[PDB]
Design a protein around this ligand. Structure first.
Ligand SMILES: C[S@@+](CC[C@H](N)C(=O)[O-])C[C@H]1O[C@@H](n2cnc3c(N)ncnc32)[C@H](O)[C@@H]1O
Ligand SMILES: O=[N+]([O-])c1cc(O)c(O)c([N+](=O)[O-])c1
Ligand SMILES: [Mg+2]
Length: 213
């Protein structure tokens, strides 16, 4: 499979225990051999700046795939900080685990195998999560809004929680984008960039929870 090839490429070309080389290996492979739905370096660079500004202690990612963004975020996390990433496809989840192991960030990241809708309500109980500092949304686009509402219902959002969403332009997340921008409960900022492995304009949306009205 493609995911297996990306992993093999990393194993044979990246420096173990070096997150940077791992990222560069994946980017090179996808740029030159096969396109893959990783956020990429262009947008990844914006992600890094946001992570550095907020220095989150607990981060939740929706959509791991092959672990590119998990490696990207975790390498910048402070000692004691945790990253929980959800992935419903067991095959992708396996690749991600191996990717994290090679990068040497396995102690910082916890992979949750399951659909976000089923896992979100169990976060407080099974993983000792109080409130989230940051959430990275990058799973199926039609899930952004329902999961954001679900996160709020479960009491996982505090005043100041940062939601960062990918693909708000391409493929697009119409309902979510309209909701956050129109809600008094969120303060939004848009970062223009480009779709991974091409000149299509895309962007990330930062929406900071202000609490309910
Ligand atoms: C765009 S790809 C992931 C990108 C990844 N963030 C990166 O940059 O490396 C997202 C994924 O989320 C999955 N995903 C979709 N719906 C999901 C859901 N409801 N809960 C969890 N995982 C889901 C797919 O199986 C796929 O691996
Ligand atoms: O089709 N695409 O170009 C993309 C890009 C992306 O960055 C995605 O996250 C995606 N998806 O989750 O389906 C699809
Ligand atoms: Mg994406």
């Amino acid at each position: 499979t493609k995911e297996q090839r990306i992993l093999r490429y990393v194993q044979q070309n990246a420096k173990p225990g070096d997150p940077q080389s791992v990222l560069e290996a994946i980017d090179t492979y996808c740029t030159q051999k096969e396109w893959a739905m990783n956020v990429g370096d262009a947008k990844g660079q914006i992600m890094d700046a946001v992570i550095r500004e907020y220095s989150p202690s607990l981060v939740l990612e929706l959509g791991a795939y092959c672990g590119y963004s998990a490696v990207r975020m975790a390498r910048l996390l402070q000692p004691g900080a945790r990253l929980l990433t959800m992935e419903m496809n067991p095959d992708y989840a396996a690749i991600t685990q191996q990717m994290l192991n090679f990068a040497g960030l396995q102690d910082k990241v916890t992979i949750l195998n399951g659909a976000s809708q089923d896992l979100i309500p169990q976060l407080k109980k099974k993983y000792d999560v109080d409130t989230l500092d940051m959430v990275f949304l990058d799973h199926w686009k039609d899930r952004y809004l329902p999961d954001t509402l679900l996160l709020e219902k479960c009491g996982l959002l505090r005043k100041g929680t940062v939601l960062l969403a990918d693909n708000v332009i391409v493929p697009g997340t119409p309902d979510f984008l309209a909701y956050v921008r129109g809600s008094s409960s969120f303060e939004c900022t848009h970062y223009s960039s480009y779709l991974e492995y091409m000149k299509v304009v895309d962007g990330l949306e930062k929406a900071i929870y202000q609490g309910p009205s």
